[PDB]
Design a protein around this ligand. Structure first.
Ligand code: FES
Ligand SMILES: [Mg+2]
Ligand SMILES: [Mg+2]
Ligand SMILES: [Mg+2]
Ligand SMILES: [Mg+2]
Lengths: 96, 85, 72, 122, 48, 109, 99, 137
RNA sequence: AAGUGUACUGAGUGCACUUGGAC
RNA sequence: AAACUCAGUUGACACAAAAUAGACUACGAAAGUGGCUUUAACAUAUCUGACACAAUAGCUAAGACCCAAACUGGGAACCCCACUAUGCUUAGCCCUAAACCUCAACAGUUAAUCAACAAAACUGCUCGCCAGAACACUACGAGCCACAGCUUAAAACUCAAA
């Protein structure tokens, strides 16, 4: 009929979802070097999702991994282990 | 059963113990430990704790929305570009 | 429109470049518009593969002299 | 199914540790497990002091006995590890590789909070 | 295909025949599971 | 009234403890406010917290503004701590009684 | 909601007004306005867009018809008789440059 | 080298020293700051009691104990005792939230002991003893 | 602060629950 | 004040409770469920529809008893001190909560809004429930009890209100 009729199609300009830094990467309860990144250096308190910038699934996975490591003796409970202080800062925190 | 002095320890810089203590207290407040201590001085019944947490979440969201609205509409405060009309 | 796919891919591959939009000229045609036209004529030729159409359109416009600067 | 036994052993000499590991694998086989593989994460200082068998230790050797066993064998394995003295601490978990890595497209968008306030004409 | 791969793996499992040799080899060796992640999702394997 | 006096003492201690930390706010904590006393209205309609003023006028104004902005949050924190089941609105009042003594001693010197 | 029939579609979450419908509606509206002008009725241009207040006032003065772009006192039409006088003649047609 | 606020790692070759003594070796000044008392104990790295002080010891009675001046006096007395014992540097570790929490350190410094590290050890129970119900007035 | 259930005491208290209250 | 001669560090150390995550809103029919591991495991037609459960409290027998705490006692109902039932485990009972999202299940709709407030308004379909207030979560009888209580539940008299 008329070739200029707008067509029914999905958005091509839509951008892919912002994958969380851990999305598609398997969290493990033995990767203390990783879990340390998501706990408070001075107290060992687990950072909330509003600080870790992680989706619900991976936030829960990190929480469970941290608890499992702590109870099984892989991770200190009351502090980020000093060996991992130089690791990249992946939590939006402004102590200083 | 942990190692001592690794938790909640701050090294004083040049002896400004006041500044170091302020930093330590800031750390405690940021991690909420002071909240926990002063709340655990007495026992909040589970019903009261649930009500308080719901109220806190509602107030947090309301404040966030109000601040966002204020920031969004602040730009219009610019002097009137059509004065005299 | 069907050409929206081409526009999206061109923006992804080369960005907005430098030929800023002169929105006042109704007959204005940008680099993305030129790419869309060349893609359409290439498809009409008989070539049907999408990726081949895209790459050959880029090369053809390069030959035409278009500075198809790559965004990334 | 496929289990992983994380084992923290009292830090001590090579012949001793080999004997303890052999005894543990013997216990697993008696309990019917098909020991898959043995891994060693080395010795290191325990994150926090752990007491066991009228004693406390600060350094331990970490190992991961991956195996397959009938479900019933797990309780017996736990009891055996608890009774053993050379084991600072033994835990048994469902082997992580068993769980499938369900793929997430990413972070889904966050709309306005779900009906946290009324819709009436107010 | 799954069972075929499993068959291959079983040849490398632990048996009483190779029990002691495998135990000693594991003792000599050392596996590592630690690795951090940057802000951009880059795995940073730790040098030993 | 003895009950009112006890309430004033408890509220003074609680407010001092609150201000000891950034719990209310880092901005408030940095100001290092010192409370002179606490007085409850006879009907329990208000709680006046008398805070000592500094010499700097701009500092006094800023401290007053921050205190007024944080009074409600402090009230909520108290009622959450259960230091008092019900706390009336908190009003921060400047205290300047010590200025007379200070300037006396200055002149007498 | 009520502008859905007139909206041609959405382009990147921006509505596009169907210019065919706009052309028909503008034809009808201009025709009606011209008819009222020919019948010598009173046409009043109303709009509270301060960006175009000056332009609208000048256009009204040029065309002879009247304009009201400033703040709209309550009842300037409902209570027109008391606000203006018993014999006041009310506008025979209004044109909302901004509704 | 740029300063750091984390404590030195025990069993690590840290060039930092104080009169040649290593951080772990430095005596520890426990400070318990309760609601109605403040107690200080400087103890050797082997936790040998080197000096002890409190508001009760300094004589402040009942309410007067919970005062910054009382805490300062306790700190000064403990500092004098520790100095007589031969102490110079001290690692301050504090628990509780008593009013003399900072005045104790103030008095200790005024008495002449160099605080090298301020540490907290507040007994925060994850979940244990159920606390008593809330007062009411 | 109010109230529901429940129990002691002689209106309060104890435990849990609800906001049909305030922050 | 009363009370203890006990207090601080360090070490050992639970049959109690389960920071942070949790700003998440998931599981379960409901009550409820937020320490870790393992096992078992989360009914169903592709509709609705009376034996089994039922928080806290309470009782029986035996254990545990850090801490908290009706009651008691002491100190100057409310405040402070100590302590008991009880909160806990086992094995049995009782079956009531503002047991509430105070909004029954299932299917469907957004077409024309509607006492008011509350959680926008409705349609179909089924079961349960109500016919002014108080008398009255009461009496009588009955069931459960195993005797001090719960469930069921009235009447008379009164009023023009509630
Ligand atoms: S965003 Fe995909 S797993 Fe976290
Ligand atoms: Mg049915
Ligand atoms: Mg039923
Ligand atoms: Mg029950
Ligand atoms: Mg008891």
């Amino acid at each position: 009929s008329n070739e200029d009729l707008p067509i029914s199609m999905e958005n091509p300009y839509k951008e892919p979802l912002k994958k969380c830094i851990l999305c598609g990467k398997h969290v493990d309860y033995k990767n203390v070097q990783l879990l340390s990144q998501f706990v408070s250096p001075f107290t060992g308190c687990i950072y909330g999702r509003h600080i870790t910038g992680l989706c619900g699934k991976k936030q829960k996975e990190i929480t469970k991994a941290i608890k499992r490591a702590q109870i099984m003796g892989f991770m200190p409970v009351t502090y980020k282990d000093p060996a991992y202080l130089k690791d990249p800062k992946v939590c939006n925190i402004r102590y200083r | 059963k942990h190692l001592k002095f690794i938790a909640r320890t701050v090294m004083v810089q040049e002896g400004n113990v006041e500044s170091a203590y302020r930093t330590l207290n800031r750390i405690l407040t940021m991690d909420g430990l002071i909240e926990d201590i002063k709340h655990r001085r007495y026992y909040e019944k589970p019903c009261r704790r649930r009500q308080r947490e719901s109220y806190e979440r509602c107030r947090r969201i309301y404040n966030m929305e109000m601040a966002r609205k204020i920031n969004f509409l602040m730009r219009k405060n610019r002097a009137d570009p059509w004065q005299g009309c | 429109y069907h050409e929206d796919r081409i526009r999206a891919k061109f923006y992804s591959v080369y960005g907005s470049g430098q030929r800023a939009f002169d929105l006042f000229n109704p007959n204005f045609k940008s680099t993305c518009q030129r790419f869309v036209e060349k893609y359409t004529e290439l498809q009409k030729l008989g070539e049907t593969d999408e990726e081949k159409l895209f790459v050959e359109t880029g090369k053809a416009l390069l030959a035409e002299g278009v500075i198809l600067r790559r965004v990334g | 199914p496929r289990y992983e036994l994380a084992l923290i052993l009292k830090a001590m000499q090579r012949p001793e540790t080999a004997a303890t590991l052999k005894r543990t694998i013997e216990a697993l086989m008696d309990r019917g497990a098909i020991v898959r593989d043995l891994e060693n994460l080395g010795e290191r200082a325990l994150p926090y002091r752990i007491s066991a068998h009228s004693q406390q230790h600060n350094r331990g050797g970490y190992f991961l006995v991956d195996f397959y066993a009938p479900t019933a064998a797990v309780e017996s394995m736990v009891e055996h590890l608890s009774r053993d003295i050379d084991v600072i601490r033994g835990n048994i978990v469902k082997h992580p590789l068993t769980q499938e890595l369900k793929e997430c497209e990413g972070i889904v968008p966050v709309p306005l909070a779900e009906k946290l306030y009324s819709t009436k004409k107010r | 295909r799954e069972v075929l791969q499993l068959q291959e793996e079983v040849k490398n499992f632990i048996t009483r025949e190779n029990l002691e040799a495998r135990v000693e080899a594991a003792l000599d060796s050392r596996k590592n599971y630690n690795w951090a992640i940057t802000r951009e999702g880059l795995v940073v394997r730790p040098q030993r | 009234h003895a009950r009112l006096r006890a309430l004033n003492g408890l509220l003074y201690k609680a407010l001092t403890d609150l201000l000891c930390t950034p719990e209310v706010s880092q901005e408030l904590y940095d100001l290092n406010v010192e409370l002179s006393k606490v007085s409850l209205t006879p009907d329990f309609s208000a709680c006046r917290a008398y805070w000592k003023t500094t010499l700097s006028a701009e500092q006094n104004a800023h401290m007053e503004a921050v205190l007024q902005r944080s009074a409600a949050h402090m009230r909520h924190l108290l009622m959450s701590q259960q230091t008092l089941r019900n706390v009336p609105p908190i009003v921060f009042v400047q205290d300047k009684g010590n200025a007379a003594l200070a300037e006396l001693d200055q002149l007498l010197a | 909601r009520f502008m859905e029939p007139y909206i041609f579609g959405s382009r990147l979450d921006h509505d596009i007004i169907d210019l065919e419908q706009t052309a028909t509606h503008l034809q009808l509206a201009l025709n009606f306005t011209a008819h009222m002008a020919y019948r010598k009725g009173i046409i009043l241009f109303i709009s509270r867009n301060r960006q175009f207040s000056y332009l609208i006032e000048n256009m009204a003065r040029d065309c002879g018809e009247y304009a009201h772009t400033r703040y709209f006192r309550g009842g300037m039409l409902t209570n027109a008789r008391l606000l203006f006088g018993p014999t006041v003649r009310l506008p025979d047609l209004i044109i909302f440059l901004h509704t | 080298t740029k300063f750091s606020i984390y404590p030195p790692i025990p069993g690590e070759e840290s060039s930092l020293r104080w009169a040649g003594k290593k951080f772990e070796e430095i005596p520890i000044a426990h400070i318990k700051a309760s609601h109605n008392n403040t107690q200080i104990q400087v103890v050797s790295a082997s936790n040998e009691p080197l000096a002890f002080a409190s508001c009760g010891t300094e004589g402040f009675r009942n309410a007067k104990k919970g005062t910054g001046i009382a805490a300062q006096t306790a700190g000064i007395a403990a500092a004098a005792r520790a100095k007589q014992k031969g102490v110079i540097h001290i690692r301050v570790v504090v628990k509780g939230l008593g009013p003399g929490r900072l005045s104790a350190m103030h008095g200790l410094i005024m008495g002449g002991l160099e605080v090298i590290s301020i540490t907290d050890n507040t007994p925060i129970p994850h979940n244990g003893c159920r606390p008593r119900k809330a007062r009411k007035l």
